[PDB]
């Protein structure tokens, strides 16, 4: 049998695509083992169902410890903002402790993400192939390289055109694009991606080019499950396709400024909405009423509902009055939006997401809230695209593009990883000859 350890980054959102990747590897006769901090172990595990206790092992990634960073802090999920840089310093003090794992363990074979390239390093000193799986899309990463080689030429295919706030942010920030790039190029033959040619096809080929490296899509991972009861009972007195989603993912805190706009926005569109609202996990001034403006939900009454916390964004975004999704575009909502059918209002944030919001609008799966010339969020903006898409119903194109996306993601099967297995089996061939 095969062994595979698998190294997600410490966020969510990518231990959630490592997991549904090992599952389909877990069916393709391989054994996994899936390596992380405890925390967000426990966070997974009740998304793996007990049929794959067999072939799925968690295995305990140890961080230096404080009483001022304890290990309930070692992941992004719900992370002050302010020990993002000590969560990525520790995170690469764990390479030792990996490297004891994968010399206990012997994998045949490590799938590693892009924010840690001592993991290539350890597997080669071990004699371990490695393959870098990058759990967000393309179309970021080529945007983004394209203009370092060819700063006078127009990036292909597209007409996207990155807004000078996120100019400015990703003008340190040369190291983490080193690290990141430096994840995939040193990926042993192929790189893995989380997307799929209907999407990201041109983009894939484009990247593949740039790097010269493989690229191979493992499609869109998508969650779907088998707190809901309450939402389910407040959104089945909608009308069909009348209310949206509002969510910022797992590791972003949207300020009171941007909540403000955000809060004013839905108020003028008159749409429905159920908007999660969270507080970083050692924020103590942490009300609902007080990030809000002053009457918000007052105001709102029957028409809005605040969840605090975390929220079942898949069964929700699957109810259907459930009419678009104010998303903040981070890949795995984006991918689950498009498997549902439901159309995005784009309101990126940061990092790969303002990518994504033009990647969602290129396709017509959705439309992006566009920030002033000063980097804001504007209440108009919201508000008008949820009149056009959601409320008044104007822009039916979008829905039309989404349900189509939706009816192509759902005929997927398992010949989604057909790729991955036959490159995963050939790179393991030619390696033990090599020895
Ligand atoms: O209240 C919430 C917020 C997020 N999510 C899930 O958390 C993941 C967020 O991943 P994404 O890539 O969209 O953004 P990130 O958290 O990495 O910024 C998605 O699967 C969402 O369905 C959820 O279930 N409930």
């Not at 972003?252 to 909405?273: D, Q, R, T």
């Not at 009454?301 to 079942?312: F, Y």
């Not at 575009?329 to 309101?347: A, L, Q, R, T």
Request: charged share 20%; hydrophobic share 40%.
């Amino acid at each position: 049998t095969t062994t595979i350890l698998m190294l997600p980054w410490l966020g969510y959102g990518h231990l959630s695509a490592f997991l549904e990747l090992a599952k389909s590897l877990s069916r393709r006769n391989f054994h996994i083992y899936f390596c992380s901090t405890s925390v967000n172990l426990d966070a997974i595990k009740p998304k793996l169902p007990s049929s794959f206790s067999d072939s799925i092992q968690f295995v305990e990634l140890h961080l230096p410890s404080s009483p001022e960073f304890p290990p309930h802090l070692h992941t992004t999920n719900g992370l002050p903002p302010t020990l993002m840089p000590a969560l990525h310093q520790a995170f690469s003090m764990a390479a030792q402790h990996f490297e004891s794992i994968l010399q206990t363990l012997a994998p045949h074979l490590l799938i590693y993400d892009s924010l840690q390239p001592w993991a290539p390093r350890v597997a080669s000193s071990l004699k371990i192939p490695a393959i870098n799986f990058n759990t967000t899309g393309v179309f970021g990463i080529s945007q983004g390289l394209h203009p370092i080689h060819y700063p006078h030429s127009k990036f292909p295919f597209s007409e996207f055109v990155l807004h000078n706030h996120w100019k400015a942010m990703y003008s340190r920030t040369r190291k983490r694009g080193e690290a990141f790039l430096y994840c995939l190029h040193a990926s042993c033959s192929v790189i893995l991606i989380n997307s799929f040619r209907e999407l990201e096809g041109k983009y894939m080929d484009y990247l593949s080019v740039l790097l010269n490296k493989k690229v191979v899509p493992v499609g869109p991972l998508v969650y779907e499950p088998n707190g809901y009861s309450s939402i389910k009972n407040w959104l089945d007195k909608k009308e069909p396709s009348s209310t949206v989603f509002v969510s910022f993912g797992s590791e972003y805190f949207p300020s009171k400024e941007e909540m403000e706009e955000i809060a004013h926005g839905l108020e003028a569109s008159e749409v429905n909405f159920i908007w999660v609202v969270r507080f970083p996990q050692g924020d103590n001034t942490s009300g609902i009423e007080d990030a809000l403006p002053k009457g918000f939900l007052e105001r709102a009454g029957e028409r809005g509902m605040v969840v605090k916390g975390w929220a079942p964004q898949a069964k929700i975004l699957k109810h259907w009055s459930t009419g678009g999704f104010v998303s903040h575009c981070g890949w795995n909502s984006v991918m689950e939006s498009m498997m549902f059918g439901v159309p995005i209002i784009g309101v990126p944030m940061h990092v790969d997401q303002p990518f994504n919001a033009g990647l969602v609008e290129e396709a017509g799966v959705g439309v992006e809230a566009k920030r002033d010339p000063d980097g804001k969020i504007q209440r108009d903006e919201v508000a008008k695209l949820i009149k056009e898409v959601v409320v008044e119903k104007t822009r039916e194109d979008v829905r039309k593009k989404a349900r189509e996306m939706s009816e192509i993601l759902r005929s997927k099967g398992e010949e989604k990883f057909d790729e991955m297995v036959a490159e995963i089996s050939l790179l393991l061939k030619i390696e033990h000859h090599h020895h």
